[PDB]
RNA sequence: GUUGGUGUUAAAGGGAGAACUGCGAGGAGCCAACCCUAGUACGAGAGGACUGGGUUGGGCCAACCUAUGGUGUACCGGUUGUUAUGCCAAUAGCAGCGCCGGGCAGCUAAGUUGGUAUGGAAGAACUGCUGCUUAGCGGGAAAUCCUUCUCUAUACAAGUUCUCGGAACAGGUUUUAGAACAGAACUUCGAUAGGCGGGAGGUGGAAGCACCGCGAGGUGUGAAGCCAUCUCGUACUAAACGA
RNA sequence: GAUGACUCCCAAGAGCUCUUAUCGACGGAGUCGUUUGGCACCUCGAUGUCGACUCAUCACAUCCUGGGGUUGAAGAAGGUCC
RNA sequence: UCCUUGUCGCAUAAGUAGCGACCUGCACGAAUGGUGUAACGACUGCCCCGCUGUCUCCGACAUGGACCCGGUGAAAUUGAA
RNA sequence: GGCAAAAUGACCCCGUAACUUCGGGAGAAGGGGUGCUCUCCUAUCUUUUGAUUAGGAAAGCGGCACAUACCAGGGGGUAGC
């Protein structure tokens, strides 16, 4: 939803570098309302590590770049979330300081050696059930 | 919208071939499909009932403006065409009376609802 | 429209408060298409009977929706509890005559409305933000090929030493347009359901894509 | 042209409001508004 | 549970669409009407009361929005060209059967619009 | 136009949340055609009523996008020039979406709705009747004022009802609301946004593989393949809080 | 406020009969400040001038709609007037 | 060429314009040249064609300011209010 | 006042009016063709080995579209000077 105020080519060609660096390194310190944005490309590039086929690999070849973070994804992030269904980043709000009142934010993955908020355990999802519309909860007191 | 300056085809078999709008008797933007327009003939056979440069009325029969029936259905022809009616130079009794003998080219049967049953009866086949 | 619902010869029956679900398209038996709105009534109930005797005016306090103690702010938790009345998403008062007066704790629903007759809705409409003239009021605008720094703005008040710099209460670009605007004397209710308590209306009911509408005139 | 009266009146209602609730890393030193990542434990 | 009111209202809508869709597929005839087909059908119009018993021409586009679902036909009938739009689950259309397929690359065959 | 303070007897230091009432201010008041009553009154016909009801249209205004159009710049596909990933393969950057054909939700109107009222009072010329020569009242105009719609208790005679008192705030995730503020939703006995699964909804036959042909290329595997939005499951992420 | 527009006064004559339906000759009476103007009081150490676009607003001495009187108003179209 | 929108014709639904003609030239006129002329004009006028938001009637969308936070931080003008 | 905006544009071929100072109007106007694939012949080419690159034949093949993006004339009729 964010524009970040950048021509839509330059905006992508930045977000690519950001997700790619977020995978090369393990943590980064960036302006929050932009971390709130890599919050999506990181996960949609983890899903391709989980799938790993030739199709869904040659597709990730377009979205990640810089180095062989491609292989880093495919080799370690899959094998470290072969189970975790959704939610592969933490996006904490450090507001460290800048000279521009711009907030700042730690963003980094989950099941590493030294994470920031010691996570919950990767539980497989339960399978779907039919939705209903009783609207029967009075909630009186 | 068929409005001032439009240049639409005569599609009865009166004298005039091409007729150029100047009005829309019951619109404020252009007149949608099925409504009397006023217009000035632009070319005629030398012998028909109408001669170039003469204000003459008309009824719309084909308009690139899409229009939907009350059925939710929608239709849109290709080009603009109208059929003539004798001007008000004849009294109110003859309101909605054509000039030629046979139109040719598909016709929408919204002319009935618009009360142009006279031109309607002559129609080849009503869309 | 008379001799229906539940009252005597002449009065105002209470209004019922619903939610704009969306629009769709029905048909009639004579094979014609009408747009449709579905207003969802969430089990509305009576929560306060206002009184000329005690308070001063005749009003039924209908609550709508459902809420939770983690969502109410204690000053209203107390209200609901003292009334002993199931929790609702939004309250709303109506003034209705001496007759058409209900007991505390009687739920309402769409069968209160006889089909085929009309309603009046009131839906806090869909503002657009700090718009300007030429959309706020359908003003025209100077041409786009001759005039500079005006292509989309407005004019100027009457003005000169007479009417001395006194712009009367005019029409300027202004803040948003979210407000409550009735659609007086609506067109008949197609159908309302015994269960599911919906109701379809010929169309064009104000209010958001949900969360807001009231109904009266019956 | 316009004097202390109007100047004070205009700069006033732009006054600094003391910040509400403010928490410190009980032992980890820093002070912070809520919802920050001061520390870890 | 306790989803946001707008979410639940859109749910009501998507539900109460297929409700009537099935409630008419229990009594009416429709084909698969992929674009590039050549279709024949009938329409009685509520103006005249007439029912033309037949129309024909390629199908150019449709939107499967639901109970409302329009599609357009390039009926060139003894004239310059006549493009029609019908809602699929009409109460009028009855003989929507005659098809004759094609191989189209595009999906909304507009380029046929002269 | 949007807000913050403040005053308002009161009981808690007196702080609030809703819900009204509405002193009073605004807004809306259009017209035609056509049919009927009725070829009736009138007139020698020619011609052609009065009035009340009914329809069909235009204008004006308010509202809504479910459809139709227009757009839809982080979607799908076609496609040119060039540079790179050695090359094939499949992608990327750039050409101010590179250019095309499409395009949901959102927005808009060319679209759709909805209004152009009734009732009540006072009362214009104008009209009548009493009078008793001073006066009495009644009709009496798209006019005025009330009823509908909107706004409103800073309405200073400052109104009334319920309820809270660790209550209201504040902050954080959003928003059908939005310039900040504001409103509204959610704040872990949780669906507030993201993420992941399932559909819907858009594009329109993926790659690899197999075939047919020398090739351009075609066919099968295959409504395949993908995904900007919409719904639906799941707390996997970020919204408790020990100031 | 002269001219100006409007109203009003009178009423020869036209209106087949008829002064006043409709007008109305000569001659007067006033209202308004809109054409033409008169005066030169404010402004020349500044009061930006025609027309158009946008945006309106008031008066009513009324173009339609709205009511009534009257007519040389049979009806209908009008006329004139409130 | 004031009278002047002269007159008539062409052309347009309608052309104080444009073109052709009339001579009733306030006040054309033969090197301060008269009349005409193929080519040529960022020269004035008119007409037609195609093209189009110039328009009926405007709409959505892109970026930059406008809005908001942290910096730095002017400018005319100013009898006092 | 069609100001602006739009549109036309390139190469090859077809054909091209009034007028005339016979040089021109003339890119007059008005049309078609433009991709790639293999084959054949033609030229040509020493960059050796016989193929390669371009032209023009003629059969396919795909796309709505083949100067596909960038680049690139709006034209015609008639006055005055």
UniProtKB/Swiss-Prot annotation, chain B:
Its main location: mitochondrion. Coiled coil: none annotated. Mostly expressed in leaves and inflorescences, including floral organs and meristems, and, to a lower extent, in pistils. GO terms for cellular component: large ribosomal subunit; mitochondrion. Keywords: Mitochondrion, Ribonucleoprotein, Ribosomal protein, RNA-binding, rRNA-binding, Transit peptide. Binds to 23S rRNA in mitochondrion. Belongs to the universal ribosomal protein uL14 family. Part of the mitochondrial 50S ribosomal subunit. This is Large ribosomal subunit protein uL14mz. It comes from Arabidopsis thaliana. The lineage of its organism: Eukaryota, Viridiplantae, Streptophyta, Embryophyta, Tracheophyta. The gene is HLP. The chain holds residues 47 to 173 of 173 of the full protein.
Curated annotation (Swiss-Prot), chain C:
It comes from the Eukaryota. It is found in: Mitochondrion. One of its GO terms (cellular component) is ribosome. Residues 143-166 are annotated as: Disordered. The keyword rRNA-binding applies. Keywords: Mitochondrion, Ribonucleoprotein, Ribosomal protein, RNA-binding, rRNA-binding, Transit peptide. Part of the 50S ribosomal subunit. One of the primary rRNA binding proteins, it binds directly near the 3'-end of the 23S rRNA, where it nucleates assembly of the 50S subunit. Belongs to the universal ribosomal protein uL3 family. This is Large ribosomal subunit protein uL3m. The lineage of its organism: Eukaryota, Viridiplantae, Streptophyta, Embryophyta, Tracheophyta.
């Amino acid at each position: 939803f964010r524009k970040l105020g950048r021509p839509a080519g330059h905006r992508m060609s930045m977000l690519r570098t950001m997700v790619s660096q977020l995978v090369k390194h393990e943590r980064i310190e960036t302006t929050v309302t932009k971390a709130k944005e890599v919050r999506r490309l990181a996960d949609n590039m983890i899903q391709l590590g989980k799938e790993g086929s030739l199709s869904a690999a040659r597709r990730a070849a377009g979205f990640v770049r810089g180095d062989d973070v491609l292989h880093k994804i495919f080799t370690e992030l899959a094998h470290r979330y072969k189970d975790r269904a959704g939610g592969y980043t933490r996006l904490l709000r450090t507001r460290i300081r800048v000279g521009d009142a711009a907030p700042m934010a730690y963003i980094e993955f989950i099941d590493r050696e030294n994470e920031l908020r010691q996570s919950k355990p990767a539980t497989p999802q339960p399978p779907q059930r039919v939705p209903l519309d009783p609207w029967e909860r009075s909630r009186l007191t | 919208f068929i409005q001032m300056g439009t240049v639409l085809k005569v599609v009865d078999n009166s004298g005039a071939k091409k007729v150029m709008c100047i009005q829309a008797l019951k619109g404020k933007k252009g007149a949608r499909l099925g409504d009397t327009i006023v217009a000035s003939v632009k070319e005629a056979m030398p012998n028909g009932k109408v001669k170039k440069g003469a204000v003459v009325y008309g009824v719309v029969v084909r308009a690139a403006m899409q229009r939907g029936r009350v059925d939710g259905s929608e239709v849109r022809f290709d080009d603009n065409a109208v059929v003539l009616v004798d001007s008000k130079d004849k009294n109110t009794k003859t309101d909605r009376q054509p000039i030629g003998t046979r139109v040719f080219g598909p016709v929408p049967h919204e002319l009935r609802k618009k009360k142009h049953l006279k031109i309607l009866a002559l129609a080849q086949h009503v869309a | 429209e008379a001799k229906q619902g539940e009252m005597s010869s002449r009065s105002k029956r209470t209004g019922i408060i619903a939610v704009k679900c969306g629009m769709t398209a029905l048909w009639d038996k004579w094979g014609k298409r009408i747009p449709i709105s579905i207003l969802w009534v969430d089990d509305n109930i009576v929560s306060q009977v206002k009184t000329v005797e005690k308070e001063g005016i005749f009003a039924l306090q209908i609550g709508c929706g459902q809420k939770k103690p983690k969502h109410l702010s204690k000053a209203v938790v107390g209200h609901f509890r003292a009334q002993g009345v199931p929790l609702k998403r939004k309250l709303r008062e109506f003034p209705v005559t001496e007759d058409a007066l209900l007991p505390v704790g009687t739920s309402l629903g769409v069968r209160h409305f006889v089909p085929g007759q009309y309603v009046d809705v009131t839906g806090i409409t869909r503002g657009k933000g700090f718009q300007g003239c030429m959309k706020r009021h359908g003003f025209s605008g100077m041409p786009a090929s001759h005039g500079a720094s005006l292509s989309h703005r407005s004019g100027g008040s009457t003005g000169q030493r007479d009417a001395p710099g006194k712009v009367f209460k005019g029409r300027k670009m202004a803040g948003r347009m979210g407000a409550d605007q009735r659609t007086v004397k609506n067109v008949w209710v197609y159908k309302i359901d015994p269960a599911r308590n919906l109701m379809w209306v010929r169309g064009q009911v104000p209010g958001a894509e949900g969360n807001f509408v009231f109904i009266k005139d019956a | 042209k316009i004097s202390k009266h109007k100047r004070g009146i205009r700069n006033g209602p732009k006054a600094l409001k003391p910040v509400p609730v403010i928490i410190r890393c009980r032992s980890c030193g820093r002070v912070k508004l809520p919802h920050f990542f001061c520390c870890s434990g | 549970k306790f989803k946001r009111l707008d979410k639940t209202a859109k749910h009501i809508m998507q539900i109460v669409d297929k409700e009537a869709v099935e409630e008419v597929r229990t009594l009416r005839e429709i084909p698969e009407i992929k674009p590039g087909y050549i279709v024949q059908l009938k329409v009685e119009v509520p103006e005249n009361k007439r029912r033309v018993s037949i129309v024909k021409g390629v199908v150019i586009a449709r939107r499967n929005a639901g109970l409302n679902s329009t599609f357009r036909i390039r009926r060139l009938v003894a004239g310059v060209g006549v493009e029609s739009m019908f809602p699929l689950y009409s109460p009028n259309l009855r003989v929507i059967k005659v098809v004759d397929k094609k191989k189209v690359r595009r999906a909304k065959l507009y380029y046929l619009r002269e």
